[model samples]
Target chain A: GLTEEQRMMIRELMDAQMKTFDTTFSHFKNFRLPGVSREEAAKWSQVRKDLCSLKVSLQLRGEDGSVWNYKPPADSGGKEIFSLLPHMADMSTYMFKGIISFAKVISYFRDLPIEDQISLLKGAAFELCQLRFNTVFNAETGTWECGRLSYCLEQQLLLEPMLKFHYMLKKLQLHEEEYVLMQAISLFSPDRPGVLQHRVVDQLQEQFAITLKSYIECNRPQPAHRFLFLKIMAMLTELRSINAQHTQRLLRIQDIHPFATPLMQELFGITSLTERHKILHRLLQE
Target chain B: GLTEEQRMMIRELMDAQMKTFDTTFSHFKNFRLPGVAAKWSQVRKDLCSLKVSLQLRGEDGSVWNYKPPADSGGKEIFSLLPHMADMSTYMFKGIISFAKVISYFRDLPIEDQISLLKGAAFELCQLRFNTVFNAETGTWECGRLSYCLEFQQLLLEPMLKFHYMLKKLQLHEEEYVLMQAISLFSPDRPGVLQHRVVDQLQEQFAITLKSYIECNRPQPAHRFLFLKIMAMLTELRSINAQHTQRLLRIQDIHPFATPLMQELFGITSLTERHKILHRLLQE
Candidate 1:
């Protein structure tokens, strides 16, 4: 009885969460950023003033001497790229909000030790972020959707290096169900540290993986699509790479925004560059 | 022994008719009418020859002006649609050729086979259409008919965009062949009798395709390429939903879909067609 109850609750949560999470992404239809006050700052255990602002680099200057949020002529637009400060701070807040709720979707998740939950969350946060954040893109076309605005993802970012990876990822077009399954896979990964009930979480991840596979089998018109799920998973490494760049863009501001989760601060602050690179290499190999 | 004969039959069917029809599509990797040849086979040229002509008469032109214009080497790919006459003649031809190769299919009751062929053939044609379309070049061609952005057929460009999304996944030729067969094994087709065969075929293709991808992909058995294709296939339903109504709108005035297409598509009236398309769009 409880399993059935749990199943419905989970679907309802997913249905509701898909709506809530989709709101957080306003590409073709939506964008949200900064404007939370000091009171909001007080509520957040770790947050910023100036939201730890991002300065427009010297490179992003104007022929007309215009700068930050400056509109360049139509052809030369987006060259004067700015910071992720307020928007990123806003994004971090929502990102934090999203997976916190992910734990609750599984009925027995709260039954797990706090240490185990935190371990799972820490390990999988980046990839889940990719699955959700990738929303700003229309994978069907290589176009980015920003409210009434639309353009390529290459246009949205400042760094030139990130374009190739984004181009690679855009070749993929994922269905809503697949992403939903990915969220589950990221959350329930068995590789997370400190799991007392290793098999339980592993089984759950396996189930989601199988479920996703069946989803592909049942629906795809052709068998050629068999490898598509893997291709999507492979893109996660590239997404992680791009995310590192987003963080670097923030860090380059000299005043790195505390907009990242405090745990992320501890995580990033402690991890050595070589170690981070190793983890990245490992993830890419995955 | 019996199953072996059936398998052999299917393999023969695979080599002959399937290969003969599928070559029209070529990408930088594989090969795009985007594959049914229904338009050419039934409406225009029979695809037996490239020589074709359409009356260059404008809409509302005098009947006398409807005389055939010079063959500028152009042909119909649909102004508003890329589907045609339900691809029935092709399906029948395909079924006959298939039966010639696959005796199991030949042995099936005529009604059962026809029922399966209707939706399955069109679905298979769509899968074939997508296989050869190159996202980079934005062009798809058969022997003589090629559509590029310059030609600017109404639906062809959007279809090319869909191809762009698909090509990103880098589908291989083996995957293409398997998917083509699997698309024809669809269970949802109306009036299907031997749906078990359809279901079995779909399953068999999945197992084989899975083996193929796992063997070929570097990151073996992971959800990397396979599921992405699956999801892309699901996304194509948006087109499936939109395409037939586009056909009806053309046929509403053009009045040229075959009697077979009219029967299969159930084209009662323009208003009814409008209602069906509207509902699908809402979905």
Candidate 2:
């Protein structure tokens, strides 16, 4: 059914593959590895080497084909089809590692019928979150407290047991689960403290309610979670900016305290720290 | 030299120096140095605070009275003269130490006067060269060879003897002698090196002769010492450049040698010699 030009291009691709196999086989013979039988090693090395070489050649071919000068046959699908081969190679590398690490979980999923894949994926997510919780909470409180509030919250969310368990089992580790969890959790966590204040809890939620009241006394999506998240970020950013401006003004005033003046000598001797808080605090107090 | 306009300009210069001094002294008092006798320390600190303020004011007055506004009483003079006060403070930190150091060599001929100024410079240069030579020798042979030749002929020629003598005397601790030497040496050595090396020797003897003969001939200078010095410098610069170019070419031909791949890296690695040679030989 194929045209003559298509047939010729297919023939050329087959020829290139044969040439690659021959070159890879020679390299396999020379690559000496202990505990690998000559025949087994040759086969294993040939397969890995040929895959790598093919990926590189296909990339080069795709680059060349993009220019207007060289044209593939009309049926040759061009770079899009060529790109699929490398993607497959990448998937193979990941799949090999995943199968070795999570043989039981993978085999269970594989044994299921094609129609059951979605149900299995849902179950996998819960298992992942349970696995993550155990990994993160093992650390001490002092260590956790050293980091910023947002960063600590992110770490805790990422280590959610179900998400980690899914990644460990399914071999999918592309997105940040912890950051996503933090965004979701902020809406509901009434006990969480906002910036600069020790007494406030659910402050963000209360602010969101007041804002949404103006938009809908009737019926709307409410958007409570999204509004609270953005409000928290804005409040933190404003607090940081005000603190910075105050410190800079204090520095320009050239304020120093007796205790800190000696400490400055101990640290950097006589060089100025443009707007450090501790230094500014002493200056302001004096 | 005493024109009405010139007198007015000097007065303005004096005013600017006075202003700079006033600002600088206030800043100086805020500076604290630890571990000294309380009575002496306070007096020393006050003296320096006042000295800097008054000296700057005096410099401005001198410029205004003696020099024309266009010639001397502008930002350029302000930047050049007042700027040096900071450098002088940095060089002489303690008041007694500063005074003592300058007083030691006060009577020496202004031309080569500082107690161990040249000797100190020479010793420091040698120490640096030795450190670099040791570091390069065991690991990078090419760099080692380049440094050895450079330090011996180019660096040592001007600095080594003077620097060694300065260190031997330990004049840094003897404040009186040190201050005397610094003051006396300051006036004489101002333009000696520039005149001797660049103008009198290189320009007249080496460059002029080479240009006239069109065959890279040495100049026919009556002073053998000047001619010998110029000839040596010319040889060192050419040889250093030639060696550097060869090293670069070697790197270019052998691309796999990672060090040879970047011309800039190779040149920078060999910069100590390159700088010394340029100062010694070229315009």
Candidate 3:
């Protein structure tokens, strides 16, 4: 169990980091299209001024809330901003560097070896990170409203399955506390196959679970045994689906863009990062 | 990249495994209520006596809050009213499909195959159920068990809510089949055996799915369809999870669940549940 200070540290760290990503993400969405940096973009200014002074960067977040510091060369022409090629690229790069730096600060993630970290990032980070951004979904409108105009979460032919997630969560009309609890739970998967720090990660999830339970009680007087938590837990399983989807998508992309999906396939004599890890383990064992 | 010979072996193994499961499941359908056969009437009576003690054996012998069943195809129990036959039919279908589909896994050690089947079969059954029910019409593909109406009431909301997913992602036949393969060959099933083998099986299905997409759909953008199918698996999992949660809560109110029905829901482990059935029938 965490002390008051440690709990605040973990809790605040998650909040600030969530805010930082949302703020930075606002810029990513803005810079990518026509009439970028819309009005909602100004809300990043509401990031509490106190947390900015004493900063330690981890996963695009700070010990206190701070916006992502990454600034693409400020001199670039506006034309470069329009393509998804730049925006998605910077967004993921920011994710990678932010995760690596952030892991050291979030002791549990830091515990794994660099190989485990790389594979985990390649594997689970997108969904776990998306857990925070999932909150930006507007349950009422059935859309995701970050900084830009809302994208419909209905059965659109082209949108990502994350849109399915948006629609599903909104359909549930899940509460904010419930969403964060689910996000925290998603981050801690002692059940994940390759993870090493299973016990500690599990402990963090229990903390969030119990905290959510008590918070549920505090909010409502007793005799209020809502299956809301169980219901929400049941719902968050979609992220697992999304995670599995991305993993497959990345592989297919690699198959198609054998050169671009981090081409080194034959160079490493391997099919995947996990496969590479398999050889590493076997060779090390001997 | 598989040789024709390798593909043939894989195909053959799947066929054999599926046959074995189908034979086993056929034996299961015989255990249901009297409507299936006259001899089963006695078994049905015995089951009623069991339900009688549990206080669920209403005058009409309904599974819950007895009714002769309405003219409509749908009804509501608002409680656990599982017809013993409903579980028998569907859970049997679950194993049959699982074996028929992933029979290639049989090439592994028998124990390993059993391990995979036990953990994955029930969840696979849940997805298999979706295929028969018309997604758009909100219809039932079943009514023989005399409880579709009750179940219709329970699943109708979530079914419609979740159907947006299937509507959005138009899956190819091969993609749908391969995704089921991926769903059942999960490496993370609790008490997992042969993690390496499961992972390989998953990857193999995944590659096949990708190749199928490339050949059939042939769009670079379509690869994530593989992931989308996996996402469907996730949604199915939530539906399954909630059902399990719902049943567990039902136990609090309607602990009258028959030992057979209990095993049918399958919250308990497979082998032990079988042992209880053996003891009950004294077979």
Candidate 4:
């Protein structure tokens, strides 16, 4: 009996939300000025957050709650400035929230110097981890668990400011070894046993190492720094190789690192900078 | 840019997960009784608990994590359900975890029930609270807070078996009132809040009243027992009514809960019952 015209209605509603989400995000990006006053930016950010929050709430309500008499915001100057594009209203509440979150982070540092932008991004990444840390896992368990680093990675790379920030950090040689290693930990660590496969970790680590190597090659100037980077990379490579080989050769390996799963590998394989960035910008910022 | 392809993909994925969730739930329900068990009814009851767990997990995962992989057992089963008939593989992973969690809770007894379902749902409700909680304006804050309750109520009613069970237990004259209350509270109340919600004295009173009500409901009973049942119902009605009223008032005032919010309201309404319940019974 779950089937009905309502499902179609929900679909349509979500489509409209998605449209608004896209429009709002696009407008924010287009209207965003590097020199906008901090107060103005913050105000805009609040407006954006509220708009996004309403969008998310509406989507969630539409999908999971009751249908009642309610009206969409009227088109006015303020509403127009803040309104999401048409049809985007159809997107999921989760997608809308993610987009708004991404947008807020991206908008914060768009005009800052490249180095400062990288620093801000670093903070954003950390904040993302915190968000994940607080996410609830099971309805039965009620236990809060750490989030997968991929989510943070997705947020970081998808938003334009954050995406550009990643490139800028790589360009400015700002992502330190410790930060890279931390990112690696976040990406590969399984939240629960038997829930996540280790191949994900293997792929993520390998990809991270590759990216780090590329970053070092492209940005690092001094021989000492480059040498240190390579040493770390070599060590990681050995560790990862051993993990891959062990996974391939053995069966019923209990102590296998949680990161060494095929799913992880696949996830990493799909980790395209452009696609990720696009998703981030589209999903998070607006 | 938000392209048609991306939008379609997201829609497809969400639809797939919803379907897969229903199929897997049916399997879980059927597994509880193959038509031979004396405890078939009890198993069926336990299945409700599991259903709650699964719904909580699925909604939470969809909101927070990346789409889950379809090859996973949870996702695979979810894809097989009719409610999610139109779902694609892409939606499987994210949607399936919820199914698994719900399946895990299916058919569990009151004694074995976990309290996390309420907490998880509560947290999900409060996730929207952060925005309003931090706002300086009381009106805005109240509006958001009310919307949070509405969201929880929306999620709780259809996705969970609690309301259905409550309705069933209330209708059964032979059932113990205390047992009914406890069953409602066990999964719904966090351990930390139990003492506050049901006081020790009231707990004892409930236990006694439950025994008395159970015997008297179907029999030529005492006038006093009838009075006691009326009293408890009154109390419960008042308590529940207050909670409902608070939520309604919040909805009335919150900009987020405005009447134009029809799409949001519809998702939580009766429209989903058939789709959700049908999938749940698919076995």
Candidate 5:
């Protein structure tokens, strides 16, 4: 009833969204690791240069054709600059791409009026990206190797919790099928705010959940792994907690820096803080 | 234990590669259609504006939720000219929105892509605007106020009838979107080079529509419903031709057509000027 092209389209979109999220934040070039010596720093810089120069062509290789390019930075010294302009632009590309992919995948998704599609993505994108990031996460190093750059979580805003969650998930050694199925389960989550098709969405989630359980039973049939399915299911709650922490921390920062990237802000739900806060204030007064 | 060799033979026939492919592909194919509630949420405001009840009424009730102005207050035929220009620009954006929703269309060879879009764009515009056509009032209840056209006898009457015909079908949002897809993928378009692939694509969408009607529509599924919807496309071609002819006539006498509008309707010479559609596709 469907073509390989449409299926390929959805997978590519999901993968691209993951890649965009993975690449959007990275440590500054001059930032030194804890306890690293000057000698080691110089040595690693040479290795970085060598690796950068050896690659002649910009190639993105993956099932979804994930892509990113590493541009050599300006020679200016430590200025402590945190410019998110380019990253924000890239994130928007994949963000919209993922939504479009979702639109095409399920007959239900496309059948959705455009508003619900937008609404679902608005709520689901952060968690979905985190799941995609887990596939490439380096648990020990607490970083993601996205393309030519390594990305570290932002400090002071759930970094430790994110690292812990990544470590927990990485330990699962999930297969691609399992990871993709989990994403499907999460995407159709019925409780998402503004979701109108609660019953149908719940049914969709149940279907994927059962499929996940079946896969676990079929493949992980070891005496020691009786609770593996439950363990994996519990991590979704952990993921939600991390997302909530991230959002709260982002709101705190909005007080100081005032997030300038319109696209990124919208994805993180930062754009609506003012109005929502106003409503809260009114409710408190009454 | 006795069937180990038999299992091996079966596995050989349905090898890992094919099995993996099937499982991977089924994720996309078997997913359920969009929910009734999701479409209603988006269409609710339009329904309220049109004064239609939210509950599903008769089989011939309105499923056309192309929201226009709540009420049109502008002056007569002249007011429509400005709105027509705006609508032209709006449809130009709609073409962009279409490409965004289906990024696969962007990967088509640029020339063939332009051919497909140019051939089908006006027809799509008519299908889209007919969503707003008030069959009873004989006016297009578009933005802010309803507007009546001067060419009622020749053009608007047939256009209104087309709207009425489709209106009675009460297509679900998916079916409407699919109809647009079928029209857009017309393989017989004049300049389309990749006719074979386009034909297969159109066939896919046709099968999809028929299957949807089979599954979703009521019992017996109105056996001829699929054929009736297909006929609308044929009728659309006639309406599309008359629309272009009228536009060409206007260009000759009025000389007020925008460059974008001319390129859209082929009112001017075929030159690099028409490549504007390509820019829209890329952006």
Candidate 6:
């Protein structure tokens, strides 16, 4: 059971995430691929010219008929030349920022023994990113279309089951609030190895789970939607299985095609002992 | 937070169900309200006609001195089941009238109603048990079949604590009904569908409970009374989970549980016995 203080803390966390989501959305609205000049990226190009202005924004789509816009970076010259490495690097950085913002929002997170904080972030960061990026996912094509950069689903598991999972969440058409709630629920998991305060974390997790259920029931009141709560919890279990396999795939991919950034390596547990030590030290300083 | 209309609706619904609760609990002298007559005559007649005997004992007696038939060690637990099950069945039957009076409960789709009751039945039983609980004597003072510590050995410590804590609140009749209704409408119960409606109803009752506390209790210390009650609800959940675990062991050891007892503890085969609760609620 959450105390009144704990409830207020959760509301604060929710408000903080809402602000983060708004910023992320606003940034995406005017977003162009990185390594590009804003003016050049904004200017019309051959790709823009060949396609109808309406169709230009819809250059790529999914099997489910979902489409999104991406502003081509000036450096790429309105072309799809970049590999998935840079895309992953950007997503990983966003996950890092999210963890930082989350820790700053609640005393509970900050008070978590430094090691538990690191353990929790290491365990949950990828899942959180997956949840956050689902907004741009294409169920038909199984790709994430964010501004000028797009990530193929295959690059992520080697990753149908992955695409199908994405499609299932996509079909739910989750509101931003629901997504953030899911993210918080995932982040506060008490079952993560190395967590010292299991009960405290469990309390927070249950509260969010209850809040998410309350949210869905309030917003989606219908006979068919009745099982949505069960569905969402089941999906979280599915997500955990996917994330476990995801790490295994990343380690294998690392042997074949070494990652470009140390941050990516550390984030994914692909690390030198030196890198891990420094990451932990850096997290504690925060 | 509940809307003004929703608050009034909850009060109306709870008042209607109060009649059923008052009737069902009429035998416990302590449970009778000021104006209501003891209506145990018909209820007792029905129980005997059904051949269900309540094995109640005196409040002064010690449970330790009680004995079962020879070869009734683990089987003694089994033997006690029929008596306990009868009590449980009566409580289960009472919920139907309680539910029938609440239009909110009746208007729910059949599946939703069943899911709510299935998830909530044990917790509601404990809430009702709290009413006749004799914290001083450490027995449940049901008229004929008062239960001593032996019957709830597995749950004694926490269950006693819960009964004692509730006794401190000295809840009004309205408060207990609201608590039962809130427990029944829990949105997070595993099989509950239409969680939103259930959740909405629960919140309405919760706010009404809070309002009642504020308007009725003027002490500065009473400010946290609402929080205390909410915490107890959480404890009730923990107790119910343990109760489920305990009954599962009994069924595993004896395998002779009644059909209704099996259903109440969720030990029945899936997809059956739901019609039991559904028919009860409908009729």
Best candidate according to DockQ: 4
Pairs that collide, model 6 = A62-A140, A62-A141, A63-A140, A63-A141, A64-A140, A70-A147, A217-B196, B56-B144, B56-B145, B72-B76
DockQ of 3: 0.00
lDDT leader: 6
Classify candidate 1 by CAPRI docking class.
Answer: incorrect
Error of 3 at A222 (Å): 73
Candidate 1 RMSD to the correct structure: 29.0
Docking class of 4: incorrect
Q: Which runs in model 3 stand beyond 4 Å of their true positions?
A: A1-286, B1-80, B88-90, B93-97, B100-103, B107-115, B143-160, B167-173, B219-223, B256-283
Q: What TM-score results for chain B in every one of the models?
A: 0.59, 0.19, 0.59, 0.20, 0.65, 0.76
CAPRI classification of candidate 6: incorrect
lDDT of 1 by residue, B1-283 (tens): 2245334534664575564463542211211012103443343322212222211111122111011122223433332122323333444344334433444445655555555555554455556666545456554543233333333343243444566667666777667656655655566666666778768776776666666676677754345777776666566656655556655655654575654456445665332433422232223
Candidate 2 local lDDT, A1-286, one digit each (tens): 3346433433433342233222111221121111107875654444333222221111111111111011111112112222223223232222222212231233222343322322222112222222222222223331111011100111443344322332332231212322222222222233322222212324433433333332232223455443443443443333334334433332322222121132222222234222322432232223
Q: Model 4 over residues A74-107: C-alpha lDDT tens digits?
A: 3242434332332222222233343234324322
Q: Tens digits of per-residue lDDT for model 6 on B1-283?
A: 5557756865776676666654334443332110102223322222221111122232322111122322212222233455466567677777666776778888987777777777888777778778877777666766545455533443345655687888888777667877888898899987777988888889988988887777678887576888888899999999788667756755564564556666656775223556677667767
Range of the 10 consecutive residues with the lowest summed lDDT in candidate 6 chain B:
B30-39
Sequence-dependent TM-score of model 3: 0.34
Total backbone collisions, model 6: 10
> Which residue pairs in model 5 clash with each other?
A107-B33, A107-B34, A108-B33, A108-B34, B72-B145, B72-B146
* lDDT value, residue B229 of candidate 6: 85
- Write candidate 2's Cα lDDT for B1-283 as tens digits: 3345334433433343233222123343322111003443332322221111111111111100011112221222121222223322322222212222332223333333222232222222222222222232211111201211113332232233322322332221112121222222232232233333322322322332332233322345323433433343334334434433443443343222222113112333223323432222222
User: Model 5, chain A: how large is the TM-score?
Assistant: 0.61
Q: What would you estimate as the lDDT of candidate 5?
A: 0.54
- lDDT tens per residue, model 4, B1-283: 3346334433443443344333222232211100003343332332222221111111112221112122221222121122211121112222223323332234333222223232222222222122223222211132111111113433343322222323333333222323333323333343323444334434543555445455545554343553544443444434443433433443333322222122212223222332432232233
Cα misplacement distance, residue B155 of candidate 2 (Å): 4.7
| Single-chain TM-score of chain A, each candidate | 0.58, 0.16, 0.56, 0.22, 0.61, 0.68
DockQ, cand. 5? 0.01
Worst 10 residues of 3 chain A by lDDT: A50-59
Model 6 misplaced stretches (Cα beyond 4 Å): A1-286, B1-7, B22-74, B150-156, B269-273
Best by TM-score: 6
